[PDB]
């Protein structure tokens, strides 16, 4: 969980509305273009992965354009973008990374094909 590891997976192609369906079922998948930048890279912890993940989003010319300037600034420094106010939940006001298969069951900490992006509300509902 908080232990190092290599990221893997292919991810999926996405449109100009990547996070549109993020409070859906399993949310939005890791963009294929993002998985290529992260694949086979060693991370200290999942937190380190998440930080790099969002940085890559801000760096991807196609995805960054789907976010406002302030959103892009956050992600650049490794912070998850803020969700629309309607999708928040308490102090959880930003998109969260979800593991389809929990770390305990089958695990898959850095398996980008087991990671998706969901809103705080969706994460609570799926749980």
């Amino acid at each position: 969980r908080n232990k190092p590891g290599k990221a893997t997976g292919k991810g999926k192609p996405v449109n100009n509305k990547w996070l549109n369906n993020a409070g859906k079922d399993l949310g939005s998948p890791v963009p294929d273009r993002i998985a290529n930048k992260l694949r086979d890279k060693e991370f200290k912890s999942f937190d380190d992965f998440r930080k790099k993940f969002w940085e890559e989003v801000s760096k991807d010319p196609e995805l960054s354009k789907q976010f406002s300037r302030t959103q892009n600034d956050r992600m650049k420094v490794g912070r998850a973008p803020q969700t629309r106010t309607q999708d928040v939940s308490g102090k959880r006001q930003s998109f969260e990374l979800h593991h389809e298969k929990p770390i305990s069951q089958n695990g898959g900490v850095y398996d980008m094909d087991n990671i998706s992006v969901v809103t705080p509300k969706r994460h609570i509902d799926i749980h």
Binding site: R69, T70, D73, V77, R79, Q82, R84, T85
Partner: protein, 87 residues
Amino acid sequence: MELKNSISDYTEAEFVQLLKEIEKENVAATDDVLYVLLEHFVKITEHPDGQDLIYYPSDNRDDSPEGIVKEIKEWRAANGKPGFKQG
């Protein structure tokens, strides 16, 4: 950037200053201070979209401090609410 009690105590320029402080805290390692500034932003503007004006700006206006001030001014004016201090 003293947090005023009302948008009426804020000149437009002062509100812009508050927005740049928010942009500064928006790139910090934590959101503790940021969330306080955002809450204040929501309270004073009283805009129904709250912080979405910052993170999810309408494409019919500039995504910048000026665009945010403009949308706030137009919404408050259209609703007969007191606006920014002329100073």
